[PDB]
Amino acid sequence: DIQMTQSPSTLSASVGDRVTITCRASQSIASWLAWYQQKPGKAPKLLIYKASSLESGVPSRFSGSGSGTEFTLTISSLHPDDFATYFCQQFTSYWTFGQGTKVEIKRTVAAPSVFIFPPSDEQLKSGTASVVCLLNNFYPREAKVQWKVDNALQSGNSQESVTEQDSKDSTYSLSSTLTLSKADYEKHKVYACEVTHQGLSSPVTKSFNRGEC
Protein backbone atom coordinates (compact mmCIF):
# COMPACT_ATOMS: atom_id res chain seq x y z
CA ASP A 1 0.00 0.00 0.00
CA ILE A 2 3.11 2.20 -0.27
CA GLN A 3 4.19 3.48 -3.68
CA MET A 4 7.80 2.94 -4.75
CA THR A 5 9.40 5.16 -7.40
CA GLN A 6 12.80 4.65 -9.05
CA SER A 7 15.24 6.92 -10.89
CA PRO A 8 16.78 6.86 -13.38
CA SER A 9 14.69 4.55 -15.56
CA THR A 10 17.63 3.80 -17.87
CA LEU A 11 21.30 4.27 -16.98
CA SER A 12 24.15 3.98 -19.49
CA ALA A 13 27.69 3.32 -18.25
CA SER A 14 30.94 1.59 -19.17
CA VAL A 15 32.68 -1.33 -17.47
CA GLY A 16 34.50 -0.14 -14.35
CA ASP A 17 32.21 2.84 -13.70
CA ARG A 18 30.41 3.78 -10.50
CA VAL A 19 26.62 3.95 -10.72
CA THR A 20 23.93 4.74 -8.14
CA ILE A 21 20.20 3.95 -8.39
CA THR A 22 17.76 5.80 -6.13
CA CYS A 23 14.50 4.33 -4.80
CA ARG A 24 11.90 6.60 -3.18
CA ALA A 25 8.93 5.68 -0.97
CA SER A 26 5.64 7.50 -0.51
CA GLN A 27 5.81 7.02 3.27
CA SER A 28 8.52 5.82 5.64
CA ILE A 29 9.36 2.12 5.40
CA ALA A 30 12.18 2.24 7.99
CA SER A 31 14.74 -0.16 6.50
CA TRP A 32 12.24 -2.73 5.15
CA LEU A 33 13.58 -2.48 1.59
CA ALA A 34 15.04 -5.14 -0.70
CA TRP A 35 16.94 -4.91 -3.99
CA TYR A 36 16.51 -7.35 -6.89
CA GLN A 37 18.40 -7.97 -10.13
CA GLN A 38 16.65 -9.44 -13.17
CA LYS A 39 18.31 -10.49 -16.43
CA PRO A 40 15.96 -10.88 -19.42
CA GLY A 41 14.24 -14.26 -19.49
CA LYS A 42 15.17 -15.02 -15.87
CA ALA A 43 13.59 -14.58 -12.45
CA PRO A 44 14.55 -11.69 -10.15
CA LYS A 45 17.43 -12.47 -7.80
CA LEU A 46 17.69 -10.91 -4.35
CA LEU A 47 20.92 -8.96 -3.89
CA ILE A 48 20.36 -6.82 -0.78
CA TYR A 49 17.91 -7.31 2.09
CA LYS A 50 16.90 -4.82 4.80
CA ALA A 51 18.45 -1.90 2.86
CA SER A 52 22.16 -2.68 3.44
CA SER A 53 22.76 -6.41 4.05
CA LEU A 54 24.30 -8.19 1.05
CA GLU A 55 22.95 -11.70 0.60
CA SER A 56 25.33 -14.66 0.41
CA GLY A 57 27.50 -14.86 -2.69
CA VAL A 58 26.74 -11.36 -3.99
CA PRO A 59 29.97 -9.50 -4.82
CA SER A 60 31.07 -6.87 -2.31
CA ARG A 61 31.00 -4.22 -5.05
CA PHE A 62 27.24 -3.99 -4.51
CA SER A 63 26.16 -1.75 -1.66
CA GLY A 64 22.89 -0.39 -0.31
CA SER A 65 22.19 2.64 1.84
CA GLY A 66 19.27 4.68 3.11
CA SER A 67 16.33 4.75 5.51
CA GLY A 68 12.78 6.03 5.66
CA THR A 69 11.76 7.41 2.27
CA GLU A 70 14.88 7.37 0.05
CA PHE A 71 17.32 4.52 -0.60
CA THR A 72 20.27 3.95 -2.91
CA LEU A 73 22.05 1.05 -4.60
CA THR A 74 25.68 1.56 -5.62
CA ILE A 75 27.92 -0.58 -7.83
CA SER A 76 31.54 0.52 -7.41
CA SER A 77 32.99 -1.24 -10.48
CA LEU A 78 30.46 -2.41 -13.07
CA HIS A 79 31.26 -5.88 -14.39
CA PRO A 80 29.76 -7.28 -17.62
CA ASP A 81 27.56 -9.45 -15.38
CA ASP A 82 26.03 -6.44 -13.56
CA PHE A 83 24.26 -4.91 -16.59
CA ALA A 84 20.61 -5.77 -15.96
CA THR A 85 17.30 -4.33 -14.74
CA TYR A 86 17.11 -3.50 -11.03
CA PHE A 87 13.96 -3.39 -8.89
CA CYS A 88 13.46 -2.24 -5.32
CA GLN A 89 10.78 -3.64 -3.02
CA GLN A 90 9.31 -2.56 0.31
CA PHE A 91 8.00 -5.33 2.56
CA THR A 92 6.46 -3.55 5.56
CA SER A 93 2.96 -2.88 4.14
CA TYR A 94 2.31 -5.86 1.86
CA TRP A 95 4.84 -5.97 -0.99
CA THR A 96 5.22 -3.36 -3.74
CA PHE A 97 7.99 -2.91 -6.30
CA GLY A 98 9.54 -0.06 -8.27
CA GLN A 99 9.19 0.52 -12.00
CA GLY A 100 12.75 -0.68 -12.60
CA THR A 101 16.14 0.69 -13.65
CA LYS A 102 17.87 -0.85 -16.67
CA VAL A 103 21.67 -0.57 -16.76
CA GLU A 104 22.89 -0.34 -20.36
CA ILE A 105 26.45 -0.66 -21.67
CA LYS A 106 27.84 2.63 -22.93
CA ARG A 107 29.98 2.16 -26.04
CA THR A 108 31.32 4.11 -28.99
CA VAL A 109 28.59 5.45 -31.24
CA ALA A 110 27.77 3.18 -34.19
CA ALA A 111 25.65 4.58 -37.02
CA PRO A 112 22.74 2.37 -38.17
CA SER A 113 22.67 0.52 -41.47
CA VAL A 114 19.21 1.18 -42.94
CA PHE A 115 17.45 -1.19 -45.34
CA ILE A 116 13.90 -1.32 -46.70
CA PHE A 117 11.91 -4.33 -47.94
CA PRO A 118 8.83 -3.96 -50.18
CA PRO A 119 5.87 -6.32 -49.73
CA SER A 120 5.84 -9.80 -51.21
CA ASP A 121 3.46 -10.64 -54.03
CA GLU A 122 2.18 -13.58 -51.97
CA GLN A 123 1.11 -11.23 -49.18
CA LEU A 124 -0.49 -8.89 -51.72
CA LYS A 125 -2.52 -11.83 -53.02
CA SER A 126 -3.85 -12.19 -49.45
CA GLY A 127 -5.10 -8.59 -49.50
CA THR A 128 -2.50 -6.97 -47.21
CA ALA A 129 0.84 -5.23 -47.70
CA SER A 130 3.63 -4.91 -45.11
CA VAL A 131 6.64 -2.63 -45.66
CA VAL A 132 9.59 -3.22 -43.33
CA CYS A 133 12.43 -0.81 -42.53
CA LEU A 134 15.48 -2.35 -40.83
CA LEU A 135 18.12 -0.60 -38.70
CA ASN A 136 21.09 -2.90 -38.04
CA ASN A 137 23.86 -2.72 -35.42
CA PHE A 138 23.61 0.80 -34.01
CA TYR A 139 24.27 2.53 -30.70
CA PRO A 140 22.69 4.23 -28.88
CA ARG A 141 19.22 2.67 -28.87
CA GLU A 142 17.53 6.07 -29.20
CA ALA A 143 16.45 6.46 -32.83
CA LYS A 144 13.58 7.96 -34.82
CA VAL A 145 12.09 5.86 -37.63
CA GLN A 146 9.45 7.93 -39.44
CA TRP A 147 7.37 6.48 -42.29
CA LYS A 148 6.53 8.84 -45.16
CA VAL A 149 3.97 7.70 -47.74
CA ASP A 150 3.80 10.07 -50.73
CA ASN A 151 5.79 12.65 -48.73
CA ALA A 152 3.16 12.44 -45.98
CA LEU A 153 4.18 11.42 -42.47
CA GLN A 154 2.33 8.29 -41.34
CA SER A 155 0.97 7.74 -37.83
CA GLY A 156 -0.69 4.79 -36.12
CA ASN A 157 -0.03 2.29 -38.91
CA SER A 158 3.38 0.86 -37.95
CA GLN A 159 4.79 -1.35 -35.20
CA GLU A 160 8.41 -1.43 -34.07
CA SER A 161 10.53 -4.15 -32.49
CA VAL A 162 13.96 -3.59 -30.93
CA THR A 163 16.41 -6.37 -30.09
CA GLU A 164 18.23 -6.76 -26.81
CA GLN A 165 21.75 -5.36 -26.60
CA ASP A 166 24.17 -7.58 -28.52
CA SER A 167 26.61 -9.72 -26.55
CA LYS A 168 29.68 -9.23 -28.76
CA ASP A 169 29.54 -5.54 -29.76
CA SER A 170 26.75 -4.06 -27.56
CA THR A 171 24.68 -2.85 -30.53
CA TYR A 172 20.94 -2.73 -31.22
CA SER A 173 18.72 -3.60 -34.17
CA LEU A 174 15.24 -2.35 -34.99
CA SER A 175 12.43 -3.27 -37.40
CA SER A 176 9.49 -0.99 -38.18
CA THR A 177 6.65 -2.68 -40.08
CA LEU A 178 4.08 -0.58 -41.96
CA THR A 179 1.03 -2.74 -42.75
CA LEU A 180 -1.64 -1.45 -45.15
CA SER A 181 -4.47 -3.13 -47.01
CA LYS A 182 -3.78 -3.92 -50.65
CA ALA A 183 -6.47 -1.41 -51.68
CA ASP A 184 -4.76 1.49 -49.89
CA TYR A 185 -1.26 0.35 -50.85
CA GLU A 186 -2.18 0.66 -54.55
CA LYS A 187 -3.49 4.20 -53.95
CA HIS A 188 -0.03 5.69 -53.37
CA LYS A 189 3.31 5.55 -55.17
CA VAL A 190 6.38 6.45 -53.09
CA TYR A 191 7.03 4.71 -49.76
CA ALA A 192 9.99 5.72 -47.61
CA CYS A 193 11.45 5.54 -44.11
CA GLU A 194 13.64 8.35 -42.77
CA VAL A 195 16.03 7.65 -39.89
CA THR A 196 17.38 10.28 -37.49
CA HIS A 197 20.27 9.10 -35.32
CA GLN A 198 23.22 10.55 -33.43
CA GLY A 199 25.76 8.54 -35.43
CA LEU A 200 24.37 9.85 -38.72
CA SER A 201 25.52 13.32 -39.76
CA SER A 202 22.29 13.82 -41.74
CA PRO A 203 18.95 11.99 -41.76
CA VAL A 204 19.03 8.95 -44.06
CA THR A 205 16.06 8.02 -46.27
CA LYS A 206 15.44 4.75 -48.13
CA SER A 207 12.54 4.71 -50.57
CA PHE A 208 10.88 2.75 -53.36
CA ASN A 209 8.11 3.58 -55.81
CA ARG A 210 5.12 1.27 -56.20
CA GLY A 211 5.40 -0.53 -59.53
CA GLU A 212 9.14 0.03 -59.98
CA CYS A 213 9.78 -2.60 -57.29
Partner: peptide, 16 residues
Amino acid sequence: FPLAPSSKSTSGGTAA
Protein backbone atom coordinates in the same frame (compact mmCIF):
# COMPACT_ATOMS: atom_id res chain seq x y z
CA PHE B 1 6.46 -13.99 -46.45
CA PRO B 2 9.89 -13.17 -47.93
CA LEU B 3 11.82 -9.95 -47.30
CA ALA B 4 13.47 -9.93 -50.72
CA PRO B 5 16.89 -8.27 -51.12
CA SER B 6 17.36 -5.59 -53.76
CA SER B 7 19.40 -2.49 -54.55
CA LYS B 8 17.34 -0.85 -51.77
CA SER B 9 18.54 -3.35 -49.13
CA THR B 10 22.27 -3.12 -49.97
CA SER B 11 24.92 -1.13 -48.10
CA GLY B 12 28.50 -1.46 -49.32
CA GLY B 13 29.00 -5.07 -50.39
CA THR B 14 26.46 -6.14 -47.74
CA ALA B 15 22.86 -7.16 -48.42
CA ALA B 16 19.91 -7.87 -46.12
